[PDB]
A paper describes a structure:
The best conserved among them, glycoprotein B (gB), is essential as it performs membrane fusion by undergoing extensive rearrangements from a prefusion to postfusion conformation. Here we report a prefusion-specific nanobody against gB that is neutralizing with cross-species activity. We determined full-length high-resolution cryo electron microscopy (cryo-EM) structures of gB in its prefusion and postfusion conformation and describe the nanobody epitope and mode of neutralization.
To support this hypothesis, and to show the cross-species activity, we co-expressed wild-type [name]-2 gB with the nanobody in stable transduced HEK293T cells. gB is a type I transmembrane protein, presenting the ectodomain at the N-terminal end to the extracellular space and hence during expression into the endoplasmic reticulum lumen. After particle picking and two-dimensional classification, several classes were produced with gB in the prefusion state, resembling our stabilized [name]-1 gB structure, in addition to classes showing the easily identifiable postfusion conformation in side and top views. We then determined the structures of the prefusion and postfusion conformations of [name]-2 gB to 2.85 Å and 2.26 Å resolution, respectively. The membrane-embedded regions including the MPR, the TMD and the intraviral C-terminal domain are not resolved in either of the two [name]-2 gB structures. No density for the bound nanobody was detected in either two-dimensional or three-dimensional reconstructions of the postfusion conformation.
Author numbering:
A (entry chain A), B (entry chain C), C (entry chain B): 103 to 457, 488 to 720
Write the structure that this text describes.
Amino acid sequence: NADAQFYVCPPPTGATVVQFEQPRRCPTRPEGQNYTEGIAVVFKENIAPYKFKATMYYKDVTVSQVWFGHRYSQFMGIFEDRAPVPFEEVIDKINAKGVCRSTAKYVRNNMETTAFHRDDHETDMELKPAKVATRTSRGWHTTDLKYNPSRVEAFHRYGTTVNCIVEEVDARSVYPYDEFVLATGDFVYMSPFYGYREGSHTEHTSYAADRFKQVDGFYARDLTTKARATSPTTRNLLTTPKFTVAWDWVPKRPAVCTMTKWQEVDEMLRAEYGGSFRFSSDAISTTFTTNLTQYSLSRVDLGDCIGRDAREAIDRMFARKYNATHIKVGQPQYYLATGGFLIAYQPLLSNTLAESVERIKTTSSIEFARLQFTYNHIQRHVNDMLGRIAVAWCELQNHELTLWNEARKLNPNAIASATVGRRVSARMLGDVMAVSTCVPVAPDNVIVQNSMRVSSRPGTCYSRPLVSFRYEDQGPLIEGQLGENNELRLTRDALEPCTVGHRRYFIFGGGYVYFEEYAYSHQLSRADVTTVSTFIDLNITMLEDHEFVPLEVYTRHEIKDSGLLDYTEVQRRNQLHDLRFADIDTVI
Amino acid sequence: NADAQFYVCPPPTGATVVQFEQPRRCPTRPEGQNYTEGIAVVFKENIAPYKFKATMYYKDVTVSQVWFGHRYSQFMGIFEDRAPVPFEEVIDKINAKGVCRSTAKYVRNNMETTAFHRDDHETDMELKPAKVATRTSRGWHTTDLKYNPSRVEAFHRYGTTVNCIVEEVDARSVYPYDEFVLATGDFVYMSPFYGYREGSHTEHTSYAADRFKQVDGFYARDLTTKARATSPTTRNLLTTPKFTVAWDWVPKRPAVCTMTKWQEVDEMLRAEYGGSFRFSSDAISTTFTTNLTQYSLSRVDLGDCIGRDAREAIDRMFARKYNATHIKVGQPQYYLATGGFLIAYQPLLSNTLAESVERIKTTSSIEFARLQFTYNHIQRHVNDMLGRIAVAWCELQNHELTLWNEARKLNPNAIASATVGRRVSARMLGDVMAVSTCVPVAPDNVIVQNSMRVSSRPGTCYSRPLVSFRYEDQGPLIEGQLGENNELRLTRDALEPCTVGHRRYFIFGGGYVYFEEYAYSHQLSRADVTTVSTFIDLNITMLEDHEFVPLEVYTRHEIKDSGLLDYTEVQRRNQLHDLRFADIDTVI
Amino acid sequence: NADAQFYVCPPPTGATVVQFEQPRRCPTRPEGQNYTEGIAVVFKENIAPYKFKATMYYKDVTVSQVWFGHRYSQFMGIFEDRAPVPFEEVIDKINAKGVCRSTAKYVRNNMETTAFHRDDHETDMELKPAKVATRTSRGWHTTDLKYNPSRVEAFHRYGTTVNCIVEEVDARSVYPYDEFVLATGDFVYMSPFYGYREGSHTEHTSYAADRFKQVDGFYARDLTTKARATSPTTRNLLTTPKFTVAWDWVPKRPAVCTMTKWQEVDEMLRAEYGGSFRFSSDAISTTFTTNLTQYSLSRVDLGDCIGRDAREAIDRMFARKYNATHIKVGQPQYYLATGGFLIAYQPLLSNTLAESVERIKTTSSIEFARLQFTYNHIQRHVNDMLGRIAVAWCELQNHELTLWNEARKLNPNAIASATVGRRVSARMLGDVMAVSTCVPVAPDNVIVQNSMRVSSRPGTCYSRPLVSFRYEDQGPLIEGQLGENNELRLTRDALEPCTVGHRRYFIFGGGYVYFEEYAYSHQLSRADVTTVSTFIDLNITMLEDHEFVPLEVYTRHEIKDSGLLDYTEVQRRNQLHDLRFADIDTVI
Ligand SMILES: *[C@@H]1O[C@H](CO)[C@@H](O[C@@H]2O[C@H](CO)[C@@H](O)[C@H](O)[C@H]2NC(C)=O)[C@H](O)[C@H]1NC(C)=O
Ligand SMILES: *[C@@H]1O[C@H](CO)[C@@H](O[C@@H]2O[C@H](CO)[C@@H](O)[C@H](O)[C@H]2NC(C)=O)[C@H](O)[C@H]1NC(C)=O
Ligand SMILES: *[C@@H]1O[C@H](CO)[C@@H](O[C@@H]2O[C@H](CO)[C@@H](O)[C@H](O)[C@H]2NC(C)=O)[C@H](O)[C@H]1NC(C)=O
Ligand SMILES: *[C@@H]1O[C@H](CO)[C@@H](O[C@@H]2O[C@H](CO)[C@@H](O)[C@H](O)[C@H]2NC(C)=O)[C@H](O)[C@H]1NC(C)=O
Ligand SMILES: *[C@@H]1O[C@H](CO)[C@@H](O[C@@H]2O[C@H](CO)[C@@H](O)[C@H](O)[C@H]2NC(C)=O)[C@H](O)[C@H]1NC(C)=O
Ligand SMILES: *[C@@H]1O[C@H](CO)[C@@H](O[C@@H]2O[C@H](CO)[C@@H](O)[C@H](O)[C@H]2NC(C)=O)[C@H](O)[C@H]1NC(C)=O
Ligand SMILES: *[C@@H]1O[C@H](CO)[C@@H](O[C@@H]2O[C@H](CO)[C@@H](O)[C@H](O)[C@H]2NC(C)=O)[C@H](O)[C@H]1NC(C)=O
Ligand SMILES: *[C@@H]1O[C@H](CO)[C@@H](O[C@@H]2O[C@H](CO)[C@@H](O)[C@H](O)[C@H]2NC(C)=O)[C@H](O)[C@H]1NC(C)=O
Ligand SMILES: *[C@@H]1O[C@H](CO)[C@@H](O[C@@H]2O[C@H](CO)[C@@H](O)[C@H](O)[C@H]2NC(C)=O)[C@H](O)[C@H]1NC(C)=O
């Protein structure tokens, strides 16, 4: 007790008047974003090589030189070479009959060299299947054993082997498609699209004209089944210095593409704001950003697959999910998104609402677009809910003004003190409130009287306790009456008829003063009285800090290590052989 | 002023009565998600090859042919070959004594060829350490110098070199482990697990039976220290056409695994909703999703490491962090998560409680699971806090009704107008409120009288100003009295005794009208009076838009370029040699 | 109707008194995080090889052996070798005059071998440009055609070719830079920084001293234009067993670096909390975390580029964006961030406020730092807005107390019931409220009287309906008067003068009871009366669940397959050749 201040308040006068702030104009809900519904196909930069089937035709020519010492034989040398099979032989012997000449006649080191199997006369040898090995393609050959000369004591002799080999191999080529490789690791410096017809003669070739041939209406004969193909092809044949390679010719534009279809999105919402389109997919949790102008497909080099694949996928998705409820609005539109993604977009409309060239470079990481989706999804919800709270809060403040301007007529002192921000006396001057600042009085300078009975006129009593006080620690003593909430009135006018059973508690300092039968009893602290709350609880807690550690499924070291052989390490090791096991400096 | 409407309101009648909406049932704080506490071990698809130590044994056989011209010597040819060391020599000469025969006797090109070092008689040569090189493994050899024939003017002569080489090399194999490679780049077309015992003879082998040998109880002798191993091994030996390779045989199942332990999580919470489990780790900020049914380990090909590694890690983590406060509930459980992660989970409980085969394919990106964790963490907090606000808001609206139904008794006109949404007169008909719509009056049609004194009975005055007005711009003039907030009463009945010091402000149009001693003074604008606010401020602001740009630490081009040599570029360049520096077409 | 409890309320007494909870201390808006403004440069671990230009000098020596059979010629062998060009020839013939000797004299297999082009006398041959090929570097050679011996029936003859070749090639080297590779796939076991001067003789070399030479003041002569360089260089020349290689010598430290500049951030904010710095960039949406202590650059092996690049970029960004408005505070600071990113940071200040060695390992994924930025950005906004709502809510609850303690004087029964939480009678005992629990009465035990007229004194009427009731289903019948909200009073004291037009509705059970001219009319349900709401609506909805699926632009299989040739697949296929097309076991 005796900690809270007391106050004496003079009667207010028109010298200072106040009014309550009138209702504020409440904010409006921000208008919801307009989304165009649509179907989309997202394309990425093509990194995969163009793949096709090819067939190699060559003869393994081997010339061994043997020395016949006493009771032992020794190879003095083994010359190994690959000779190309001529076109006449590929067409008239291999494809027509499944045989090869037992001789190899070809140009090597600027000389026309000729080899004969076993050094015998030329004969047509039957091609037969190679021994099976796992994961390899088909192959055929004419000979299993190497031929070596027969013994002649103390002589050096030579023996020739000629094995005609045929192999089906996968061929690979990368943009700009001016050369290709075979599964054997052999390069071919000619475009896989090179030919005579349809302007294909302008494609790249590093070889002389006579090294190339194109056969129209060619029918392949299978070497194992001996069956002839049902339909013809345009067969390309190229004779390199080491082998002849054949493959089916096809037009370039419909075969290759610098873009690859990546995602088919049947629910792609398009929004427009800030001079850009936002294409968001709820299924893949991704948001792409683009300029408002379409990207002309004429800018894409070899982009013919884009329109073709987009139209097929869009029509398929539309038929599967929308044919019964929506319509297509115009033809597909193309947009280039940040990160190098090309989006083919088909806008839709519900039935109920129907009244020079370059290459795009795609990033390897989509995470920026998934963070964009996630941030936008959360931001939109938080801004919506906080916007609703801001509106409701303003409406509540305006609505309660009706209670405040009614309460002020009942107790202007309390309402003025609560709104002005300091203890004041107040009085209504019609429709405005006059105010005056109250003077504080220390709790030590007040004394309550022991009785509320009016001795001067029995049967009448004071409504509130009589009090005695002084403005300063030393000075005159003033007689007054206790008012509401530590108020000290300069007049003893609050009177009532005395009634039996009188019990009262009045606020006195930081506690209460109890009275019975118009006589003092004792002081109390607020803790002595039962407390009930007019407050509605709201337990809001902050979202705690969180630390994201670095995390990878496979480190780049594990990715480098997953390869069975590392060309760099094999070469480093093999080239150290002479430095480890020989002497590169001593001369004899 | 004249910038606001006036109103005349007829006395209400029981024709229209209203009541206040009774307290609404407030929403309940939703029940929190139940979490099982547990320890987890997350496994990913294994991409690393199986690694083991092997030893190669071969002889570098070299036959040089030299021409001895006048005052100069010239190599006419240098034949180089690698011959395998026979099993008898690997066991009885190399491993037993650290020596090799100075001869090489082997099969090449279907012939039994024999070579002698320096063309001398056979002798046992001592193996000695190879010259040191950085980053390479150990190696031994018998000879440093190449042997070339001695000069004989105008003759072609031959000279043989045989260098026995032994090398320790790293071997690698990938699933299904049917072949392996050596650090030299050489392939071995046999499973590293092939053998005779324990059903290992069913493993793959491309070689004839006599090319393989298995020595039980083999003791390796170190070629440098000459020390014999303390414990024996089962030694596999395979003679290929180019070299003999040896390695220790081990059972397949305990050696390889198609899954790899990736993360050990000591605090993995498991929630269940929507027919799926959500495994979340606060430490790695990741949430995995799975079906409710366990994944049977019997489905995993070669998955024996999963149970073994999971049990070891779970027990280790439990001992370190939980032995004093929790218990294990049942045996470890296995669940396959979206993205191809296999989770081994051990449920825990506080001490205070309980009274054909496949290959899993793992994604290289964990970001979907980290976005899932982040979104769930934010969503859960926002839904909790907004849920608490929704509850408190409803509780407050219900609580406030007690003040509203008390305020309506004091001023039914203002309270009815504030709740009905339009200006009306009102009256309490017991426990309901009768209402009637007020007719507007333009401010131009009203005139206030200059005095509030009652001339007919001095000493009495009007409580509020007398007013004169008309309903229409031209029509009869009606005499009345000013009511509250621009109300116009049709009766001059509000009276009081006249008192000295009378000062009053009354609402008049968009401002006030001041009076002194019951006589008019002047009009005022609301801006002329001091304003105090009954409103509690709340400054909510929207979360701004944010653009995420693409960002990579290393682009795939930088990753590709990080390799020292590129096999494709080296081959492309080397195969162009004849097209650049020679003539592949001219014939002489 | 007759579906809600009635209550008999006894007069309260001082046996139980209550007070309202006094205003709570409202929470404070937490102090905002302080941010130091600055410019930053982020460095990552360097993965790119050191690249430099080199020139190879070698002679392609070819010795063919031809057999001249009747009407055909055949190669018996073709020995091919690469011989290094001596220093005297590179300097005095090639660089001085653009010619090579037509002979090759070099050491091979411990013998000094000499070859003569066409077996003719030595002559100086002119180097001329090689035939053009796409994507290859420059090259020169002396000879186009291979030389083969002329026909001599039934003889074996030998022919020598010597083609001097010069090629400009790209050289690559990786840390620790102790060796390098050429574009041809050839390794050089010497540091590219090796030399004599400036302590460079301490660098690695696997070659003998006489195999290396360094020419100071060397002037390169272009082989095509014949023009001599304007400025000299220090030329390194190394003769390996297969070729001579030359390159310009440069000091190591300024040429290589173990770190690479990755991002230049002109707006990097640095915050400090929890004993760590947080460097956030709004432009790249990334937050890096570091310890408070700077990372000493002296710890970085070969880190000289870090200081140089940081100072250049910081000064450039400052000049472009800050020179007119800020100042630099001290020299650049270096901090190592989680994930292995080294941050060079330059603190700034606005003009208005101016009064052994290691190698850092960088993660390939930045996503943890982008999640960190995103989470922090959302968390900070949500905590700010919810913090403001918590403050405003408390301020509102405290402000409303002024209305509550005024309403209790008007209707203590209703206000006590609303705050205590159960139906009670109440009375003000001065400044505290006395309370007493009301006893319930079932609606079935209540009967209303048909008239409100006081028969004993005409002209006077009861203010509220007269009622009859019993406490139990069987017992004495008590006469009383209807109070507020289903209260039953034990005294018929509420009286008024009877007036014309009397109409009233009183709460009776879950409905109302209507009266006219002081006589009963009928009962009504609440639904029969027009309802108006005192509640402010707030429609909060939960943020729905969302599932993030795995998503990748390119799978690791597509990345692996993007390479044109795969060394592992080519070797696997080529080493199977004999197992497929030959017989490795048969002996003849
Ligand atoms: C979102 O789309 C709606 C139509 O669905 C647009 O609303 C129309 O706006 C104009 C201009 O104010 C009015 O004349 C129409 O009467 C509105 N139509 C309807 C049905 O209300 C709106 O402008 C669009 N908003 C944005 C941000 O693009
Ligand atoms: C969207 O359009 C803007 C131009 O309005 C493009 O921005 C330019 O891009 C080029 C290439 O990077 C730069 O050379 C220019 O300096 C940029 N200008 C500006 C003002 O920033 C932007 O690349 C387009 N984006 C997409 C996805 O199409
Ligand atoms: C306000 O809400 C928080 C929860 O957000 C309450 O804190 C939890 O209290 C229990 C009981 O002591 C603890 O076991 C939990 O660990 C606490 N959780 C957190 C996240 O701190 C808090 O008690 C509530 N306060 C009030 C006054 O109701
Ligand atoms: C979450 O776990 C709690 C126990 O911690 C479950 O609560 C019990 O639920 C039953 C059925 O309604 C009641 O009989 C008990 O009285 C509850 N116990 C307590 C302590 O409240 C709850 O059912 C679980 N909920 C879910 C969704 O799993
Ligand atoms: C969880 O179980 C569901 C089946 O209830 C699995 O979904 C099926 O997966 C196959 C193979 O991808 C598809 O062909 C089916 O069309 C799917 N069915 C449905 C109804 O979607 C799902 O793969 C399982 N997930 C995990 C992580 O085990
Ligand atoms: C409401 O809060 C915002 C901050 O969220 C206050 O905005 C600042 O206003 C000043 C004055 O225009 C600017 O100098 C600051 O740059 C603003 N800060 C931000 C982050 O925008 C705003 O003043 C507050 N409004 C009220 C009425 O208090
Ligand atoms: C953040 O920076 C501000 C200055 O912009 C610091 O504010 C001072 O804080 C102390 C301690 O309460 C006060 O005595 C001063 O009066 C404040 N200065 C001003 C100009 O307001 C503050 O210390 C900093 N806080 C942190 C966490 O770094
Ligand atoms: C920041 O400083 C702390 C030490 O105060 C470093 O923490 C240690 O990191 C190493 C390597 O991971 C561990 O072997 C130690 O056990 C860690 N010590 C402790 C007490 O945890 C931390 O690596 C530093 N981080 C940065 C980015 O510099
Ligand atoms: C509260 O707000 C929600 C939106 O957050 C309203 O829900 C929409 O209601 C219409 C009509 O039923 C539907 O067509 C939409 O699909 C709903 N949207 C969502 C996101 O659910 C809801 O009607 C509002 N409730 C009240 C009482 O106004």
